[PDB]
């Protein structure tokens, strides 16, 4: 027992929600204990019911958000149940050494491993499976990616000496999928990940996804699963993309404070319309809602947003502010005396 | 009449030019009145005369640049003449609430609407049509996008307490187009936007444009339509892309001051070679010309620049500075005594 | 002889290595003399032995890194030997005027030219061939690109008044290639660049590379050609991409200090996981190695990294730090008493 710190077990929750944590803490460093269980399974990824052979951490795309503080140690038990068919591992972009931990975590079905990494770098970071060679992109675009947030012990700040505090946090994992089609253009189904591989790799090589989804499927965060907020709340939106660039935008809002490269040692940018998540990274945006109603959260390649699945909704309760925006005149016939050339 | 401010009607001009405005102002907030008239029409988009079924604000791709100051109110009359075939609306990324105004501006052919939004956020911002669902990307990549600039009341600054003033301003709207081809590879023509839709959507889904153009067509800002400047002038170049990333570069120049995310509350970066406009945003670059001659302004995917249409020219008058650059020896035969291995 | 400064001849070296230079200097400005010889040749670009008709500066993809200091003059002799088939030129993004020098350097086979440019802007910058029209992207994606670094005379700094010094420097040139395929999907071979052009241009137009390589071929910087370092060394990694965006990531490390837009007048960002090189630019990252072993340096589109060629290796000598990372428990059977749902 060389490392003599208190230990705290964390129970992960499914995205887009985040496990209970403190923003600012006066506790000293701890060993924060997390468990991730690999689950290979067929999953529905669009509104027409298209399936595909997914590979996940903890049964979700993305994998769950892990939250710790600068100077904590993160002790992760990775489990690969014997019902799975492939070896798996984990690479933390937050970690230092051994390919992020991938070189110390390769486990066959039936095995588990325990990795500890010190959280020396603040920000939001990707974690993903990376077995080796061509298996790396395949496992990641099959769903094996998530994120970790390493908060400063004093919480977030605006880079100019003022504390920032969120009222709510959501984790939006964006996934690019490469689903094979038959000669007629219909999506193909397979009985195992291994059976899907060869055809999937051919799609992957052309670098054009068939689907781009939030929380694992088209429409996952719309309708009854819209994200809730209230006028006045400061909401932190963490966005990850393990393989491909994204350009987040909150339709009808802004990013008040945006860390687009995702690292809290850098001052955020202010008042952004659209920001940029480079493939292989996580970023974060804070916004204080000023108006009630529906907001669409998109990647602002609108073809991807509307036609390949990458739209979420916020439903925001409160009172409308006519000073910020108003309909002066409702739709009406163009007046006869008008000249509109 | 709740809002008791002076009203000023603005007459928009066609890009790449910009309507008359003040950089710094000591006037108080005003209600700035703008009129935008939707025009569906066939347009020529390349040097071989390829046509396509465009949808525009005010008859241009991009739509005109609107310029106001922080704290002004922007009252926009959107008109959809009965000669048009589709409903249209407008979403201002500069605005707060109702999907940027899209949820308050949906108008059928024969109708108009009046929206007012308060200009609370400084920078350059996209505006675009967004009717709903798959119509959103289709209307935007058919040409229904422009930009608005919200200046600080004191004008631009370098983020370090020094005023910046431009001598000239140009607005470069970049448009990604998705023109269907027949089995031989020739571009297809249609008699209406509705007829073009199904084939266009198939091209859109593969996320590879057929054309990437400035000011609505290949070659629009070359030859007799090159952009004018003079040695010593500080020129502000506003660049928008409503759907797809761009990487602007001034060949033979630099960006002296660049707001690549486009928001004046953030200090600009200095001395850039190439900058990055994320899809769904506008950015701005200031450059003081130091040499006369032709400059090419490109997106620095050179395939897009040279082969898909995305090159503009500046023609700059003045005297050559041999200290910054000189041809020491003109092209000449390689000397016989040379060894060139 | 108007310009009366000392002259220093520099001998370029092949990437990823860099010619001898000083970081900080107290010498005054000099005329720094460089020679670049165009070489058209067939080159191997992947591990299956695929060839293609390359065009290079000095026989390498990328062309060599040139290093000077702010206020130096750079006098470049460009040579186009009579064994070559095409005209060539050079455009320095570091330079001011005449399309970066391209308008003053067009040379036929059998000719040479001498251009001088003043190094007024600090940072890392692309240089590339740009003959005119469609020849510009073709020459660049055929291999005719490199970089120049213009250091501040006091060396690098952290933008907050502290000097930064590297122990080692590597130049990673990333190249997107567009190799034609036959009806069966096999890569086509040609006897000259001219013969390859028409088919190559068709691939280029679809904006999807067949290969994305570091130092001119898949696997170039892996195995016996891995990049060396030691625990404790501060290594500067210069990364260029003349045509297409890249997202560099050091697997198992970070960017301690990153200039992603590549210009030293801007403070670096700290503690990045992944950074972004916009097409048509160079950037630079400093990292101090903390752990020994193998590191993969990738573009973090992992399909490009693993399947299209864009992976380099570092081999780092030193002692493992179990405080930063440790394998708490090696792979072992999942305990019988476990519940893993
Ligand atoms: O800010 C640059 C800095 O990163 C350093 C901090 O000094 O270290 C980072 O990783 C180290 C891992 O132990 C920690 O010192 C530090 O707390 C963390 O941000 C250096 O390697 C370098 O100056
Ligand atoms: O996309 C090509 C082509 O395939 C068809 C079926 O023949 O539809 C498929 O592709 C669509 C777009 O991805 C999906 O909407 C659908 O689930 C799928 O069957 C054609 O409709 C289409 O043109
Ligand atoms: O700088 C962050 C800031 O944005 C705020 C300003 O306090 O508001 C922005 O939008 C508001 C709309 O009324 C205005 O207060 C402000 O002038 C504008 O930049 C907050 O919501 C937040 O601190
Ligand atoms: O691009 C495919 C193929 O189509 C042809 C006509 O058969 O040319 C078309 O496509 C060209 C590239 O976009 C355009 O230059 C032209 O206007 C269009 O007819 C072939 O020439 C080409 O290989
Ligand atoms: O920082 C903005 C600045 O760039 C300027 C410097 O004053 O010039 C750059 O290019 C000039 C070329 O002579 C040099 O003055 C300078 O050393 C270099 O960074 C201006 O044109 C402008 O303020
Ligand atoms: O990529 C299409 C198709 O072509 C084949 C040969 O028929 O392989 C070629 O393409 C591969 C992927 O780029 C390369 O690995 C190889 O060098 C090349 O011959 C098929 O194997 C493949 O499905
Ligand atoms: O140690 N107190 O939270
Ligand atoms: O399946 N993912 O939320
Ligand atoms: O572990 N790879 O299939
Ligand atoms: O109020 N004067 O410009
Ligand atoms: O048609 N647009 O300039
Ligand atoms: O309004 N949409 O076609
Ligand atoms: O002038 N001395 O290095
Ligand atoms: O061939 N290039 O290193
Ligand atoms: O110089 N162009 O082939
Ligand atoms: Cu895996
Ligand atoms: Cu990774
Ligand atoms: Cu419209
Ligand atoms: Cu938008
Ligand atoms: Cu050339
Ligand atoms: Cu260039």
PDB file of C-alpha atoms and ligand atoms in Angstrom, chain A residues 202 205, chain C residues 48 50 181 184-187, ligand 6:
ATOM      1  CA  UNK A 202     -14.576  -0.237 -46.469  1.00  0.00           C
ATOM      2  CA  UNK A 205     -11.829   4.213 -45.529  1.00  0.00           C
TER       3      UNK A 205
ATOM      4  CA  UNK C  48       2.309  -2.498 -49.542  1.00  0.00           C
ATOM      5  CA  UNK C  50       2.272   1.564 -53.684  1.00  0.00           C
ATOM      6  CA  UNK C 181      -7.502   3.183 -58.642  1.00  0.00           C
ATOM      7  CA  UNK C 184     -10.958  -3.589 -59.280  1.00  0.00           C
ATOM      8  CA  UNK C 185      -9.782  -1.032 -56.635  1.00  0.00           C
ATOM      9  CA  UNK C 186      -6.002  -1.546 -57.142  1.00  0.00           C
ATOM     10  CA  UNK C 187      -3.776   1.598 -57.192  1.00  0.00           C
TER      11      UNK C 187
HETATM   12  O1  LIG D   6     -10.141  -0.155 -51.679  1.00  0.00           O
HETATM   13  C1  LIG D   6     -10.981  -0.832 -52.662  1.00  0.00           C
HETATM   14  C2  LIG D   6     -10.662  -2.345 -52.882  1.00  0.00           C
HETATM   15  O2  LIG D   6      -9.451  -2.549 -53.649  1.00  0.00           O
HETATM   16  C3  LIG D   6      -8.592  -3.619 -53.175  1.00  0.00           C
HETATM   17  C4  LIG D   6      -8.069  -4.404 -54.393  1.00  0.00           C
HETATM   18  O3  LIG D   6      -9.180  -4.908 -55.129  1.00  0.00           O
HETATM   19  O4  LIG D   6      -7.416  -3.270 -52.379  1.00  0.00           O
HETATM   20  C5  LIG D   6      -6.809  -1.982 -52.726  1.00  0.00           C
HETATM   21  O5  LIG D   6      -7.275  -0.947 -51.882  1.00  0.00           O
HETATM   22  C6  LIG D   6      -6.783  -1.234 -50.526  1.00  0.00           C
HETATM   23  C7  LIG D   6      -7.332  -0.177 -49.621  1.00  0.00           C
HETATM   24  O6  LIG D   6      -6.826   1.025 -50.098  1.00  0.00           O
HETATM   25  C8  LIG D   6      -5.236  -1.326 -50.316  1.00  0.00           C
HETATM   26  O7  LIG D   6      -5.137  -1.878 -48.978  1.00  0.00           O
HETATM   27  C9  LIG D   6      -4.425  -2.103 -51.431  1.00  0.00           C
HETATM   28  O8  LIG D   6      -2.932  -1.755 -51.617  1.00  0.00           O
HETATM   29  C10 LIG D   6      -5.253  -1.958 -52.758  1.00  0.00           C
HETATM   30  O9  LIG D   6      -4.883  -2.966 -53.765  1.00  0.00           O
HETATM   31  C11 LIG D   6      -9.553  -4.357 -52.258  1.00  0.00           C
HETATM   32  O10 LIG D   6      -8.710  -5.133 -51.415  1.00  0.00           O
HETATM   33  C12 LIG D   6     -10.386  -3.211 -51.665  1.00  0.00           C
HETATM   34  O11 LIG D   6     -11.628  -3.605 -51.156  1.00  0.00           O
END
